Protein backbone atom coordinates (compact mmCIF):
# COMPACT_ATOMS: atom_id res chain seq x y z
CA UNK A 1 0.00 0.00 0.00
CA UNK A 2 1.28 3.44 -1.02
CA UNK A 3 -1.25 5.29 1.09
CA UNK A 4 -0.90 2.82 3.98
CA UNK A 5 -4.48 1.70 3.83
CA UNK A 6 -4.72 -1.85 2.64
CA UNK A 7 -1.45 -3.60 3.51
CA UNK A 8 -0.96 -1.02 6.31
CA UNK A 9 -3.24 0.00 9.16
CA UNK A 10 -6.33 -1.92 7.94
CA UNK A 11 -4.72 -5.40 8.05
CA UNK A 12 -7.08 -7.55 5.88
CA UNK A 13 -10.45 -6.81 4.23
CA UNK A 14 -14.07 -7.46 5.29
CA UNK A 15 -15.28 -10.54 3.36
CA UNK A 16 -18.88 -10.17 4.57
CA UNK A 17 -19.34 -6.88 2.70
CA UNK A 18 -20.45 -7.75 -0.86
CA UNK A 19 -22.20 -4.50 -1.91
CA UNK A 20 -19.21 -2.36 -2.95
CA UNK A 21 -15.42 -2.06 -2.79
CA UNK A 22 -15.19 0.24 0.19
CA UNK A 23 -17.31 0.49 3.37
CA UNK A 24 -18.28 0.50 7.02
CA UNK A 25 -18.87 -1.92 9.95
CA UNK A 26 -21.28 -0.62 12.60
CA UNK A 27 -21.61 -2.37 16.02
CA UNK A 28 -23.94 -0.29 18.24
CA UNK A 29 -26.63 -1.14 20.86
CA UNK A 30 -29.24 -2.27 18.23
CA UNK A 31 -26.94 -4.76 16.48
CA UNK A 32 -23.96 -5.30 14.18
CA UNK A 33 -23.79 -5.17 10.37
CA UNK A 34 -21.79 -4.20 7.27
CA UNK A 35 -22.86 -1.36 5.00
CA UNK A 36 -21.01 -0.36 1.80
CA UNK A 37 -20.42 3.21 0.57
CA UNK A 38 -21.80 3.05 -2.93
CA UNK A 39 -20.94 6.62 -3.96
CA UNK A 40 -17.15 6.34 -3.59
CA UNK A 41 -17.22 2.84 -5.07
CA UNK A 42 -19.02 4.20 -8.14
CA UNK A 43 -16.29 6.78 -8.83
CA UNK A 44 -13.68 4.09 -8.60
CA UNK A 45 -15.50 1.90 -11.08
CA UNK A 46 -16.16 4.88 -13.37
CA UNK A 47 -12.40 5.48 -13.24
CA UNK A 48 -11.24 1.90 -13.78
CA UNK A 49 -13.86 1.35 -16.53
CA UNK A 50 -12.33 4.40 -18.18
CA UNK A 51 -8.68 3.27 -17.83
CA UNK A 52 -9.32 -0.05 -19.48
CA UNK A 53 -11.40 1.65 -22.18
CA UNK A 54 -8.60 4.17 -22.80
CA UNK A 55 -5.89 1.49 -23.16
CA UNK A 56 -7.87 -0.24 -25.93
CA UNK A 57 -9.70 2.66 -27.58
CA UNK A 58 -6.51 4.75 -28.22
CA UNK A 59 -4.87 2.11 -30.33
CA UNK A 60 -7.77 2.18 -32.90
CA UNK A 61 -5.10 3.19 -35.43
CA UNK A 62 -4.59 -0.13 -37.17
CA UNK A 63 -4.98 -0.85 -40.94
CA UNK A 64 -4.45 -3.51 -43.58
CA UNK A 65 -1.60 -5.92 -43.21
CA UNK A 66 0.02 -9.10 -44.70
CA UNK A 67 2.46 -12.11 -44.67
CA UNK A 68 5.38 -13.35 -46.85
CA UNK A 69 6.02 -13.15 -50.57
CA UNK A 70 9.68 -13.33 -51.83
CA UNK A 71 11.56 -16.06 -53.74
CA UNK A 72 14.93 -17.57 -52.80
CA UNK A 73 16.75 -15.32 -55.32
CA UNK A 74 15.69 -12.31 -53.18
CA UNK A 75 16.64 -13.58 -49.70
CA UNK A 76 18.21 -10.21 -48.76
CA UNK A 77 14.88 -8.39 -49.02
CA UNK A 78 13.15 -11.30 -47.20
CA UNK A 79 15.66 -10.73 -44.40
CA UNK A 80 14.73 -7.03 -44.40
CA UNK A 81 11.10 -8.06 -43.93
CA UNK A 82 12.11 -10.29 -41.00
CA UNK A 83 14.10 -7.47 -39.35
CA UNK A 84 11.16 -5.10 -39.46
CA UNK A 85 8.54 -7.64 -38.49
CA UNK A 86 10.60 -9.06 -35.63
CA UNK A 87 11.49 -5.46 -34.70
CA UNK A 88 7.85 -4.42 -34.17
CA UNK A 89 7.01 -7.59 -32.35
CA UNK A 90 9.82 -6.73 -29.91
CA UNK A 91 8.53 -3.17 -29.37
CA UNK A 92 4.87 -4.02 -28.98
CA UNK A 93 5.53 -6.92 -26.66
CA UNK A 94 7.75 -4.80 -24.46
CA UNK A 95 5.42 -1.79 -24.45
CA UNK A 96 2.42 -3.96 -23.80
CA UNK A 97 4.00 -6.12 -21.11
CA UNK A 98 5.20 -3.06 -19.18
CA UNK A 99 2.07 -1.03 -19.64
CA UNK A 100 0.16 -3.71 -17.86
CA UNK A 101 2.70 -3.94 -15.05
CA UNK A 102 2.71 -0.14 -14.64
CA UNK A 103 -1.02 0.49 -14.79
CA UNK A 104 -1.59 -2.42 -12.44
CA UNK A 105 0.52 -0.91 -9.69
CA UNK A 106 -1.28 2.44 -9.91
CA UNK A 107 -4.72 0.73 -10.15
CA UNK A 108 -4.06 -1.04 -6.83
CA UNK A 109 -2.80 2.21 -5.30
CA UNK A 110 -5.86 4.10 -6.50
CA UNK A 111 -7.85 1.75 -4.20
CA UNK A 112 -5.54 2.41 -1.26
CA UNK A 113 -6.07 6.10 -2.00
CA UNK A 114 -9.85 5.84 -1.98
CA UNK A 115 -9.88 3.92 1.29
CA UNK A 116 -7.51 6.29 3.11
CA UNK A 117 -9.64 9.23 1.91
CA UNK A 118 -12.81 7.59 3.14
CA UNK A 119 -11.28 6.96 6.62
CA UNK A 120 -10.08 10.61 6.53
CA UNK A 121 -13.60 11.87 5.62
CA UNK A 122 -15.02 10.15 8.69
CA UNK A 123 -12.11 11.28 10.89
CA UNK A 124 -12.57 14.99 10.06
CA UNK A 125 -16.32 15.06 10.88
CA UNK A 126 -15.88 13.64 14.41
CA UNK A 127 -12.71 15.20 15.80
CA UNK A 128 -12.76 14.64 19.59
CA UNK A 129 -16.20 12.95 19.66
CA UNK A 130 -14.49 9.58 19.02
CA UNK A 131 -11.24 7.71 19.66
CA UNK A 132 -8.81 6.70 16.84
CA UNK A 133 -8.18 3.03 17.59
CA UNK A 134 -5.47 2.38 14.96
CA UNK A 135 -7.08 -0.73 13.41
CA UNK A 136 -8.93 1.94 11.44
CA UNK A 137 -11.91 1.95 13.81
CA UNK A 138 -13.65 4.65 15.82
CA UNK A 139 -14.81 4.18 19.45
CA UNK A 140 -17.54 6.69 20.31
CA UNK A 141 -17.49 8.54 23.63
CA UNK A 142 -21.30 9.01 23.38
CA UNK A 143 -24.19 6.73 22.43
CA UNK A 144 -24.88 6.82 18.66
CA UNK A 145 -27.88 4.71 17.49
CA UNK A 146 -28.78 3.50 13.94
CA UNK A 147 -30.51 6.84 13.09
CA UNK A 148 -27.40 8.77 14.31
CA UNK A 149 -24.97 6.70 12.14
CA UNK A 150 -26.69 7.40 8.80
CA UNK A 151 -25.43 10.98 9.44
CA UNK A 152 -21.82 9.72 9.41
CA UNK A 153 -22.30 7.82 6.11
CA UNK A 154 -24.43 10.61 4.55
CA UNK A 155 -21.87 13.08 5.91
CA UNK A 156 -24.36 15.30 7.79
CA UNK A 157 -22.96 14.63 11.30
CA UNK A 158 -23.50 17.40 13.91
CA UNK A 159 -20.47 18.10 16.08
CA UNK A 160 -22.36 20.52 18.42
CA UNK A 161 -25.20 18.04 19.20
CA UNK A 162 -22.99 15.46 20.94
CA UNK A 163 -20.09 17.75 22.01
CA UNK A 164 -20.64 18.01 25.81
CA UNK A 165 -21.56 14.28 26.12
CA UNK A 166 -18.10 13.21 24.96
CA UNK A 167 -16.02 16.09 26.36
CA UNK A 168 -17.23 15.46 29.91
CA UNK A 169 -16.94 11.64 29.42
CA UNK A 170 -13.23 12.26 28.63
CA UNK A 171 -12.15 13.69 32.03
CA UNK A 172 -13.92 10.82 33.90
CA UNK A 173 -11.39 8.30 32.57
CA UNK A 174 -8.51 10.83 32.88
CA UNK A 175 -7.88 10.49 36.65
CA UNK B 1 -20.47 1.94 20.04
CA UNK B 2 -18.12 1.73 17.01
CA UNK B 3 -17.63 2.66 13.30
CA UNK B 4 -14.79 0.87 11.56
CA UNK B 5 -13.89 1.25 7.82
CA UNK B 6 -12.69 -1.35 5.33
CA UNK B 7 -12.54 -2.72 1.81
CA UNK B 8 -14.11 -5.60 -0.15
CA UNK B 9 -12.63 -9.03 -0.61
CA UNK B 10 -14.14 -12.21 -2.03
CA UNK B 11 -13.13 -15.71 -3.16
CA UNK B 12 -11.25 -14.81 -6.39
CA UNK B 13 -8.04 -16.53 -7.39
CA UNK B 14 -7.03 -14.36 -10.39
CA UNK B 15 -3.41 -13.33 -10.01
CA UNK B 16 -2.05 -10.22 -11.73
CA UNK B 17 1.56 -9.16 -12.09
CA UNK B 18 2.58 -5.61 -11.16
CA UNK B 19 5.80 -3.69 -11.59
CA UNK B 20 6.91 -4.08 -7.93
CA UNK B 21 5.16 -7.33 -6.97
CA UNK B 22 4.56 -10.54 -8.96
CA UNK B 23 1.66 -13.04 -8.64
CA UNK B 24 -0.71 -10.80 -6.65
CA UNK B 25 -4.15 -12.17 -5.90
CA UNK B 26 -6.78 -9.60 -6.97
CA UNK B 27 -10.56 -9.24 -6.58
CA UNK B 28 -11.47 -8.63 -10.23
CA UNK B 29 -9.70 -8.36 -13.59
CA UNK B 30 -9.78 -7.93 -17.34
CA UNK B 31 -7.99 -9.84 -20.13
CA UNK B 32 -6.38 -7.65 -22.82
CA UNK B 33 -4.91 -10.43 -24.95
CA UNK B 34 -6.80 -12.28 -27.68
CA UNK B 35 -5.87 -15.94 -27.38
CA UNK B 36 -8.55 -17.67 -29.41
CA UNK B 37 -9.41 -18.34 -33.04
CA UNK B 38 -12.31 -20.08 -34.86
CA UNK B 39 -9.87 -22.14 -36.88
CA UNK B 40 -11.60 -21.80 -40.24
CA UNK B 41 -10.73 -19.07 -42.74
CA UNK B 42 -13.41 -16.53 -43.52
CA UNK B 43 -14.56 -13.53 -45.54
CA UNK B 44 -12.96 -10.09 -45.18
CA UNK B 45 -15.88 -7.66 -45.02
CA UNK B 46 -18.19 -9.69 -47.25
CA UNK B 47 -15.54 -10.75 -49.73
CA UNK B 48 -14.98 -14.44 -50.58
CA UNK B 49 -11.27 -15.35 -50.57
CA UNK B 50 -9.93 -17.25 -53.59
CA UNK B 51 -9.13 -20.76 -52.30
CA UNK B 52 -6.87 -22.90 -54.49
CA UNK B 53 -6.72 -26.42 -53.14
CA UNK B 54 -4.51 -28.62 -55.36
CA UNK B 55 -3.56 -25.72 -57.61
CA UNK B 56 -1.22 -22.72 -57.67
CA UNK B 57 -1.83 -19.29 -59.18
CA UNK B 58 0.20 -20.04 -62.29
CA UNK B 59 -1.81 -23.22 -63.02
CA UNK B 60 -5.08 -21.41 -62.35
CA UNK B 61 -4.48 -18.54 -64.79
CA UNK B 62 -3.42 -21.01 -67.44
CA UNK B 63 -5.64 -24.06 -68.00
CA UNK B 64 -3.90 -26.74 -65.94
CA UNK B 65 -5.96 -29.86 -66.60
CA UNK B 66 -5.27 -31.65 -63.27
CA UNK B 67 -6.99 -28.98 -61.13
CA UNK B 68 -10.15 -27.18 -62.40
CA UNK B 69 -10.68 -23.56 -63.59
CA UNK B 70 -14.44 -23.63 -62.84
CA UNK B 71 -13.90 -20.90 -60.21
CA UNK B 72 -16.09 -18.16 -61.72
CA UNK B 73 -15.89 -15.99 -58.59
CA UNK B 74 -15.67 -12.41 -59.95
CA UNK B 75 -14.25 -10.75 -56.82
CA UNK B 76 -11.91 -11.60 -53.92
CA UNK B 77 -9.89 -10.30 -50.94
CA UNK B 78 -6.90 -12.58 -50.71
CA UNK B 79 -5.59 -15.75 -52.26
CA UNK B 80 -4.99 -19.02 -50.38
CA UNK B 81 -2.46 -21.50 -51.78
CA UNK B 82 -1.08 -24.46 -49.88
CA UNK B 83 2.53 -24.99 -48.78
CA UNK B 84 3.62 -26.88 -51.90
CA UNK B 85 0.63 -26.98 -54.30
CA UNK B 86 0.57 -30.24 -56.26
CA UNK B 87 -0.08 -28.70 -59.73
CA UNK B 88 2.15 -25.65 -60.51
CA UNK B 89 2.89 -26.36 -64.19
CA UNK B 90 2.23 -29.64 -65.99
CA UNK B 91 4.74 -28.67 -68.71
CA UNK B 92 7.86 -27.54 -66.82
CA UNK B 93 9.18 -24.05 -67.13
CA UNK B 94 9.24 -20.63 -65.58
CA UNK B 95 6.87 -17.64 -65.18
CA UNK B 96 8.35 -14.11 -65.58
CA UNK B 97 7.70 -11.64 -62.70
CA UNK B 98 5.47 -14.37 -61.16
CA UNK B 99 5.64 -12.92 -57.70
CA UNK B 100 4.63 -9.46 -58.86
CA UNK B 101 1.74 -10.83 -60.86
CA UNK B 102 0.79 -12.79 -57.75
CA UNK B 103 0.65 -9.56 -55.78
CA UNK B 104 -1.33 -7.84 -58.55
CA UNK B 105 -3.94 -10.59 -58.63
CA UNK B 106 -4.10 -10.95 -54.85
CA UNK B 107 -7.08 -8.56 -54.57
CA UNK B 108 -9.45 -7.98 -57.43
CA UNK B 109 -12.67 -6.06 -57.66
CA UNK B 110 -14.08 -7.26 -61.03
CA UNK C 1 -14.28 -11.49 -39.84
CA UNK C 2 -12.42 -8.25 -39.72
CA UNK C 3 -9.13 -10.10 -39.97
CA UNK C 4 -7.58 -13.45 -40.85
CA UNK C 5 -4.69 -15.74 -39.98
CA UNK C 6 -3.48 -19.10 -41.34
CA UNK C 7 -4.45 -20.77 -38.02
CA UNK C 8 -7.92 -19.26 -37.93
CA UNK C 9 -9.74 -15.94 -37.69
CA UNK C 10 -9.74 -13.34 -34.94
CA UNK C 11 -12.38 -11.13 -33.35
CA UNK C 12 -10.06 -8.10 -32.86
CA UNK C 13 -11.89 -6.16 -30.11
CA UNK C 14 -8.93 -6.22 -27.72
CA UNK C 15 -5.60 -4.68 -28.81
CA UNK C 16 -3.10 -7.58 -28.70
CA UNK C 17 -3.04 -11.16 -30.06
CA UNK C 18 -0.66 -14.11 -29.94
CA UNK C 19 -2.05 -16.30 -32.67
CA UNK C 20 0.14 -16.05 -35.75
CA UNK C 21 2.51 -13.42 -36.93
CA UNK C 22 1.34 -13.18 -40.57
CA UNK C 23 -2.18 -11.84 -40.75
CA UNK C 24 -4.48 -10.29 -43.33
CA UNK C 25 -6.60 -7.29 -42.37
CA UNK C 26 -7.24 -4.92 -39.44
CA UNK C 27 -5.72 -7.18 -36.83
CA UNK C 28 -4.57 -6.06 -33.38
CA UNK C 29 -0.84 -6.07 -32.56
CA UNK C 30 1.04 -9.40 -32.61
CA UNK C 31 2.76 -9.89 -29.30
CA UNK C 32 5.00 -12.73 -28.10
CA UNK C 33 3.37 -13.39 -24.72
CA UNK C 34 0.82 -15.68 -23.12
CA UNK C 35 -0.70 -13.37 -20.52
CA UNK C 36 -1.71 -9.71 -20.36
CA UNK C 37 -4.15 -9.37 -17.52
CA UNK C 38 -5.16 -6.05 -16.13
CA UNK C 39 -6.11 -5.23 -12.59
CA UNK C 40 -9.50 -3.77 -11.79
CA UNK C 41 -10.32 -4.72 -8.16
CA UNK C 42 -7.84 -4.61 -5.22
CA UNK C 43 -5.69 -6.95 -3.08
CA UNK C 44 -7.66 -10.00 -1.98
CA UNK C 45 -6.74 -11.01 1.59
CA UNK C 46 -7.52 -14.43 3.15
Amino acid at each position, epitope marked *: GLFGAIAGFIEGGWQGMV*D*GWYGYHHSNEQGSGYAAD*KEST*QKA*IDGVTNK*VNSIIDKMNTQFEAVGREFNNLERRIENLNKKMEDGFLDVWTYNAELLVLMENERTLDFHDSNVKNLYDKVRLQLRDNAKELGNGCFEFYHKCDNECMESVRNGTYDYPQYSEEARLKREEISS | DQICIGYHA*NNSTEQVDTIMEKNVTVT*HA*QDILEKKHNGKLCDLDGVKPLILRDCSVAGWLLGNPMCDEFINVPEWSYIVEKANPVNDLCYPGDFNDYEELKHLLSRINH | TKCQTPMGAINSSMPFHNIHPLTIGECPKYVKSNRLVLAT*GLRNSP
Partner: antibody, heavy 118, light 109 residues
Protein backbone atom coordinates in the same frame (compact mmCIF):
# COMPACT_ATOMS: atom_id res chain seq x y z
CA UNK D 1 -26.85 -1.46 -27.58
CA UNK D 2 -28.72 -4.26 -25.70
CA UNK D 3 -29.64 -7.65 -27.20
CA UNK D 4 -31.94 -10.40 -25.95
CA UNK D 5 -32.45 -14.07 -26.99
CA UNK D 6 -35.19 -15.40 -29.35
CA UNK D 7 -38.75 -16.53 -28.61
CA UNK D 8 -39.16 -19.79 -26.68
CA UNK D 9 -42.39 -21.78 -26.05
CA UNK D 10 -42.57 -23.91 -22.86
CA UNK D 11 -45.14 -26.13 -21.15
CA UNK D 12 -46.47 -25.06 -17.71
CA UNK D 13 -44.09 -26.18 -14.93
CA UNK D 14 -41.12 -26.23 -17.34
CA UNK D 15 -38.44 -23.51 -16.76
CA UNK D 16 -37.12 -20.71 -18.99
CA UNK D 17 -33.72 -19.00 -19.23
CA UNK D 18 -33.41 -15.64 -21.05
CA UNK D 19 -30.16 -13.88 -21.92
CA UNK D 20 -29.59 -10.15 -22.22
CA UNK D 21 -26.10 -9.40 -23.56
CA UNK D 22 -25.18 -5.79 -22.85
CA UNK D 23 -22.40 -4.02 -24.73
CA UNK D 24 -19.96 -2.91 -23.55
CA UNK D 25 -16.63 -3.99 -25.02
CA UNK D 26 -15.35 -4.92 -21.56
CA UNK D 27 -16.52 -6.17 -18.14
CA UNK D 28 -19.84 -4.51 -17.35
CA UNK D 29 -20.23 -1.41 -15.31
CA UNK D 30 -24.06 -1.29 -15.21
CA UNK D 31 -26.73 -3.02 -13.20
CA UNK D 32 -29.09 -5.00 -15.43
CA UNK D 33 -32.75 -5.09 -14.30
CA UNK D 34 -35.66 -7.06 -15.71
CA UNK D 35 -39.18 -5.90 -16.55
CA UNK D 36 -41.95 -8.10 -17.99
CA UNK D 37 -45.21 -7.17 -19.70
CA UNK D 38 -48.22 -9.52 -20.20
CA UNK D 39 -49.88 -8.39 -23.47
CA UNK D 40 -52.33 -5.48 -22.99
CA UNK D 41 -51.69 -4.85 -19.29
CA UNK D 42 -48.73 -2.66 -18.15
CA UNK D 43 -45.16 -3.08 -16.85
CA UNK D 44 -44.10 -5.27 -13.94
CA UNK D 45 -40.55 -4.98 -12.56
CA UNK D 46 -39.00 -8.32 -11.59
CA UNK D 47 -35.43 -8.09 -10.32
CA UNK D 48 -32.13 -6.25 -10.71
CA UNK D 49 -28.54 -7.57 -10.64
CA UNK D 50 -25.63 -5.21 -9.80
CA UNK D 51 -22.59 -5.07 -11.97
CA UNK D 52 -19.29 -5.99 -10.41
CA UNK D 53 -20.20 -8.30 -7.51
CA UNK D 54 -23.04 -10.43 -8.90
CA UNK D 55 -25.42 -9.92 -5.99
CA UNK D 56 -29.10 -9.82 -7.10
CA UNK D 57 -32.25 -8.36 -5.49
CA UNK D 58 -35.70 -9.76 -6.37
CA UNK D 59 -39.30 -8.71 -5.67
CA UNK D 60 -41.23 -10.29 -2.76
CA UNK D 61 -43.86 -11.33 -5.38
CA UNK D 62 -41.61 -13.93 -7.05
CA UNK D 63 -38.52 -14.48 -4.81
CA UNK D 64 -38.51 -18.28 -4.43
CA UNK D 65 -39.01 -19.14 -8.13
CA UNK D 66 -36.82 -16.67 -10.10
CA UNK D 67 -33.03 -16.27 -10.27
CA UNK D 68 -30.87 -13.86 -12.34
CA UNK D 69 -27.19 -14.58 -12.91
CA UNK D 70 -24.37 -12.46 -14.24
CA UNK D 71 -21.54 -13.48 -16.53
CA UNK D 72 -18.84 -10.83 -16.17
CA UNK D 73 -16.38 -11.43 -19.07
CA UNK D 74 -18.91 -11.10 -21.93
CA UNK D 75 -21.04 -8.65 -19.86
CA UNK D 76 -24.22 -10.76 -20.14
CA UNK D 77 -27.07 -11.08 -17.66
CA UNK D 78 -29.36 -14.10 -17.51
CA UNK D 79 -32.91 -14.64 -16.19
CA UNK D 80 -34.19 -18.05 -15.01
CA UNK D 81 -37.84 -18.61 -14.13
CA UNK D 82 -39.25 -21.70 -12.32
CA UNK D 83 -42.64 -23.50 -12.33
CA UNK D 84 -44.29 -21.41 -15.06
CA UNK D 85 -48.03 -20.66 -15.01
CA UNK D 86 -50.46 -19.66 -17.80
CA UNK D 87 -50.27 -15.97 -16.71
CA UNK D 88 -46.43 -15.78 -16.91
CA UNK D 89 -47.02 -15.67 -20.70
CA UNK D 90 -45.53 -12.29 -21.53
CA UNK D 91 -42.83 -10.10 -23.19
CA UNK D 92 -39.68 -9.84 -21.02
CA UNK D 93 -37.37 -6.78 -21.25
CA UNK D 94 -33.92 -6.24 -19.78
CA UNK D 95 -32.84 -2.73 -18.93
CA UNK D 96 -29.42 -1.61 -18.00
CA UNK D 97 -29.45 1.68 -16.06
CA UNK D 98 -26.65 4.30 -15.92
CA UNK D 99 -24.50 2.70 -13.25
CA UNK D 100 -24.15 -0.30 -10.96
CA UNK D 101 -26.63 0.24 -8.11
CA UNK D 102 -29.32 -0.26 -9.55
CA UNK D 103 -31.54 2.87 -9.55
CA UNK D 104 -32.83 4.96 -12.65
CA UNK D 105 -33.17 3.30 -16.16
CA UNK D 106 -31.93 4.54 -19.56
CA UNK D 107 -31.29 1.87 -22.20
CA UNK D 108 -33.87 -0.82 -22.79
CA UNK D 109 -33.54 -4.12 -24.63
CA UNK D 110 -35.66 -5.55 -27.41
CA UNK D 111 -37.71 -8.21 -25.62
CA UNK D 112 -38.56 -11.91 -25.79
CA UNK D 113 -41.98 -13.54 -26.35
CA UNK D 114 -42.51 -16.46 -23.95
CA UNK D 115 -45.72 -18.45 -24.38
CA UNK D 116 -46.88 -20.93 -21.70
CA UNK D 117 -49.96 -22.87 -22.93
CA UNK D 118 -48.68 -26.34 -24.11
CA UNK E 1 -44.50 -2.85 -1.46
CA UNK E 2 -45.14 0.80 -2.39
CA UNK E 3 -48.12 0.65 -4.77
CA UNK E 4 -48.30 3.46 -7.35
CA UNK E 5 -51.59 4.56 -8.88
CA UNK E 6 -51.74 6.66 -12.08
CA UNK E 7 -54.61 8.88 -13.17
CA UNK E 8 -56.30 9.41 -15.47
CA UNK E 9 -56.18 5.98 -17.15
CA UNK E 10 -57.16 7.50 -20.52
CA UNK E 11 -56.82 11.12 -21.68
CA UNK E 12 -58.69 12.33 -24.76
CA UNK E 13 -56.82 15.43 -25.95
CA UNK E 14 -56.29 17.26 -29.26
CA UNK E 15 -52.92 18.00 -30.92
CA UNK E 16 -51.64 21.25 -29.28
CA UNK E 17 -53.29 21.12 -25.81
CA UNK E 18 -51.63 20.28 -22.41
CA UNK E 19 -51.80 16.80 -20.81
CA UNK E 20 -51.41 16.35 -17.04
CA UNK E 21 -50.68 12.83 -15.79
CA UNK E 22 -50.76 12.12 -12.05
CA UNK E 23 -48.87 9.50 -9.97
CA UNK E 24 -49.85 9.00 -6.29
CA UNK E 25 -47.79 6.79 -3.95
CA UNK E 26 -49.22 4.55 -1.20
CA UNK E 27 -46.41 5.90 0.98
CA UNK E 28 -43.49 9.05 1.15
CA UNK E 29 -41.24 8.26 -1.86
CA UNK E 30 -37.65 8.01 -0.65
CA UNK E 31 -35.74 11.19 -1.75
CA UNK E 32 -37.58 11.98 -5.07
CA UNK E 33 -36.52 8.84 -6.99
CA UNK E 34 -39.43 8.52 -9.39
CA UNK E 35 -39.29 8.09 -13.12
CA UNK E 36 -41.57 8.35 -16.15
CA UNK E 37 -41.36 6.15 -19.28
CA UNK E 38 -43.09 6.18 -22.74
CA UNK E 39 -44.18 3.07 -24.70
CA UNK E 40 -45.58 3.15 -28.24
CA UNK E 41 -47.36 0.16 -29.83
CA UNK E 42 -44.88 -2.51 -31.04
CA UNK E 43 -41.77 -0.80 -29.57
CA UNK E 44 -39.84 -1.03 -26.32
CA UNK E 45 -39.95 1.68 -23.59
CA UNK E 46 -38.16 5.06 -23.65
CA UNK E 47 -36.88 6.92 -20.64
CA UNK E 48 -38.49 10.32 -20.22
CA UNK E 49 -37.68 11.67 -16.78
CA UNK E 50 -35.78 10.52 -13.70
CA UNK E 51 -35.32 11.99 -10.23
CA UNK E 52 -38.86 13.44 -10.32
CA UNK E 53 -38.06 16.36 -12.71
CA UNK E 54 -34.67 15.84 -14.51
CA UNK E 55 -35.01 15.33 -18.28
CA UNK E 56 -33.05 12.55 -19.98
CA UNK E 57 -30.76 13.17 -22.92
CA UNK E 58 -32.42 13.64 -26.33
CA UNK E 59 -35.81 14.87 -25.08
CA UNK E 60 -37.85 18.04 -25.88
CA UNK E 61 -38.47 20.71 -23.21
CA UNK E 62 -42.27 20.18 -23.44
CA UNK E 63 -41.91 17.04 -21.28
CA UNK E 64 -41.45 18.20 -17.67
CA UNK E 65 -41.90 16.65 -14.24
CA UNK E 66 -42.73 17.89 -10.76
CA UNK E 67 -43.94 17.05 -7.27
CA UNK E 68 -42.43 15.45 -4.19
CA UNK E 69 -43.22 13.24 -1.19
CA UNK E 70 -46.35 11.32 -2.19
CA UNK E 71 -47.79 13.27 -5.20
CA UNK E 72 -46.06 13.49 -8.63
CA UNK E 73 -47.08 15.04 -11.93
CA UNK E 74 -45.80 14.77 -15.53
CA UNK E 75 -46.86 17.55 -17.89
CA UNK E 76 -46.66 17.81 -21.69
CA UNK E 77 -47.19 21.36 -23.02
CA UNK E 78 -47.78 21.05 -26.80
CA UNK E 79 -48.97 17.56 -27.75
CA UNK E 80 -47.80 16.42 -31.21
CA UNK E 81 -48.59 13.31 -33.32
CA UNK E 82 -45.65 11.33 -31.90
CA UNK E 83 -46.60 11.69 -28.19
CA UNK E 84 -49.84 9.70 -28.22
CA UNK E 85 -48.87 6.52 -26.34
CA UNK E 86 -48.88 4.88 -22.85
CA UNK E 87 -47.01 6.54 -19.94
CA UNK E 88 -45.77 4.66 -16.92
CA UNK E 89 -44.41 6.13 -13.70
CA UNK E 90 -42.13 3.99 -11.52
CA UNK E 91 -40.60 4.50 -8.08
CA UNK E 92 -37.13 3.12 -7.51
CA UNK E 93 -36.45 4.47 -3.97
CA UNK E 94 -36.67 1.01 -2.41
CA UNK E 95 -37.01 -2.63 -3.50
CA UNK E 96 -39.41 -3.76 -4.83
CA UNK E 97 -39.49 -1.06 -7.52
CA UNK E 98 -43.02 -0.79 -8.86
CA UNK E 99 -44.81 0.69 -11.84
CA UNK E 100 -48.05 2.58 -12.26
CA UNK E 101 -50.69 0.81 -14.33
CA UNK E 102 -50.74 2.75 -17.59
CA UNK E 103 -52.13 6.28 -18.17
CA UNK E 104 -52.83 6.31 -21.98
CA UNK E 105 -53.11 9.45 -24.15
CA UNK E 106 -55.30 9.32 -27.31
CA UNK E 107 -56.38 11.84 -29.98
CA UNK E 108 -59.73 13.69 -29.57
CA UNK E 109 -62.06 13.72 -32.59
Amino acid sequence: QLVQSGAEVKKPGSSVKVSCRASGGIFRSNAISWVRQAPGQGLEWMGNIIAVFGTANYAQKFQGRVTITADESTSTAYMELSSLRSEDTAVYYCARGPYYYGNSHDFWGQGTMVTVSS
Amino acid sequence: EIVLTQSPGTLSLSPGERATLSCRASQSVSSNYLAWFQQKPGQAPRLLIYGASNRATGIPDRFSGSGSGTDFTLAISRLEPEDFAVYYCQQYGTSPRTFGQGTKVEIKR
